[PDB]
Each structure stands twice: as structure tokens, then as C-alpha cells.
């Protein structure tokens, strides 16, 4: 219409179509760039109407080929929502509603919206699927899917290349992990203090001191600092690993 970027109706399906394509691409990360484009042309020919150009599909493929970053984490995630874990709503920082204009797979700029604390327990970590709170300090409390002996923690953020302004300044920096013996404790035990490295890999794993046998089902992620973003901090995914009791 105007060509203006705005929260229009065209914006709706275009976002819906985008990460619908993305969840399909991971299945063909081991396929040729030529083979991938042919398949993508058929999911388009499964719902979309127009027979897309031969290279236009190929370009979406080339673009989608770096919305993928390797996930080598094979450990059980006891903070995974679909596994039975949940974010304790009343025990989280106030959700900060923020948005960023970024380029989608189709080249069209889209407003990407920040979500509820729930998404930090969700595997989808595409740009925007993160929970933001105001300032460099915040916290989220998670009830794990099972009572475990915590042994490690995994924190990930979007890659720099897909991040707003190609910097990662909104990523958490120094953080602490707390364990709560029950849901009725509100006297946390400090499991460990770490720092998410902005210059490191998107996915980073941190392990605790391996001699304390304390058992937990409730865990707090407390962000102490971020990587310089003066307005907010957002978390893409928080994982909790350990041994089942
Ligand atoms: Mg997520």
C-alpha cells in the first residue's frame, strides 16, 4: 500500500509464515542449497498462491541458512516448559514491552515483539522470542519439571549478526543462580555466579561446584548486569541441568 512499516494486517501472516518456514529449514540444514529451494517452493505451493521466482525462493533459502546456529546441548533441560516446567509469574521482574525493526527472510522489515517470561523456557530463540525487563537488573523464577540436583546451567542469546544494530548489548552479563528448597522458602541458596560472554558463542553452559548435594525444584535466574544496553535486558532461553533425585 504505502510501503510504510507498521503493525498492519500484512504484518501478521508475514510473521506467521516466516518462522513457519524457519522451523522447516532445520530439517534440511544437511541438504544442498539447490535441494532446499525446491522444497521451500512446495511449502509455498502448499499454502501460498503465487508461483515464486526461481531465485526468489533461493534467496529466502540463503537468508534462512543463517538463522540457524548449531545446538550441541544434549543434556536434559529440566526448565523446559513442554517438559513440565513453568515460570512462577508473581516471582519475576515486571515484563518490559519493547520492539525492534529487523529484516525477515523475505527482506521485508518487520516489528519484532518482546514476549512474556514464559518464552525463556521455550526452544524457539529467533530474534524477538525473548523476555525483556527494564534496566540491567532483573530476575525470573522457574519451577522445574522435576526435583533435581542442579549441576549446570545454559544461557543463550541471539547471534550478533541477527541482533539489533549487530551488537548484543541487551544480553545478560553477570548473573547468579539461586536454589529454593520448596515453593514456600523465599530464602534462596546461591548455587553460582557467572558471566555470559558477549564475544563468545550464542549458547553458553555454566556448571556449579560438584560437591554440594542440595536438591531443588525451584530455581532463580538473577541478572546482575547486561552488556551495556541502557534501556532493557532480554533473555532468549534459560536451561537448567542436573541429576534426578
Ligand atoms: Mg525463547
Automatic annotation (TrEMBL):
Superkingdom to which the source organism belongs: Eukaryota
UniProt subcellular location: Nucleus inner membrane
UniProt protein name: MKIAA0668 protein
Organism of this sequence: Mus musculus (Mouse)
Chain segments annotated as coiled-coil in the UniProt record: 7-34
Signal peptide region: none
SUN domain location: 84-245
Amino acid at each position: 500500500r504505502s510501503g510504510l512499516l507498521q503493525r498492519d494486517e500484512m504484518h501478521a501472516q508475514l510473521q506467521e509464515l516466516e518462522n513457519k518456514i524457519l522451523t522447516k529449514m532445520a530439517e534440511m540444514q544437511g541438504k544442498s542449497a539447490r535441494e532446499a529451494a525446491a522444497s521451500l517452493g512446495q511449502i509455498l505451493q502448499k499454502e501460498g498462491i503465487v508461483g515464486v521466482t526461481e531465485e526468489q525462493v533461493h534467496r529466502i533459502v540463503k537468508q534462512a541458512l543463517q538463522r540457524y546456529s548449531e545446538d550441541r546441548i544434549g543434556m536434559v533441560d529440566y526448565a523446559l516448559e513442554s517438559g513440565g516446567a513453568s515460570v512462577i509469574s508473581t516471582r519475576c521482574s515486571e515484563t518490559y514491552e519493547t520492539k525492534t525493526a529487523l529484516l525477515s527472510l523475505f527482506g521485508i522489515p518487520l516489528w519484532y515483539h518482546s514476549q512474556s517470561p514464559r518464552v525463556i523456557l521455550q526452544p524457539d530463540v529467533h530474534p524477538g522470542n525473548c523476555w525483556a525487563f527494564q534496566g540491567p537488573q532483573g530476575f525470573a523464577v522457574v519451577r522445574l519439571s522435576a526435583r533435581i540436583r542442579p549441576t549446570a546451567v545454559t544461557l543463550e542469546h541471539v547471534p550478533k549478526a541477527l541482533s539489533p544494530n549487530s551488537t548484543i548489548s541487551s544480553a545478560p552479563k553477570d548473573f547468579a543462580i539461586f536454589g529454593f528448597d520448596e515453593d514456600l522458602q523465599q530464602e534462596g541458596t546461591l548455587l553460582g555466579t557467572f558471566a555470559y560472554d558477549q564475544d563468545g558463542e550464542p549458547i553458553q553452559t555454566f556448571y556449579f561446584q560438584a560437591s554440594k548435594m542440595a536438591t531443588y525444584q525451584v530455581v532463580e535466574l538473577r541478572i546482575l548486569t547486561n552488556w551495556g544496553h541502557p534501556e532493557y535486558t532480554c533473555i532468549y532461553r534459560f536451561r537448567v541441568h542436573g541429576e534426578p533425585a
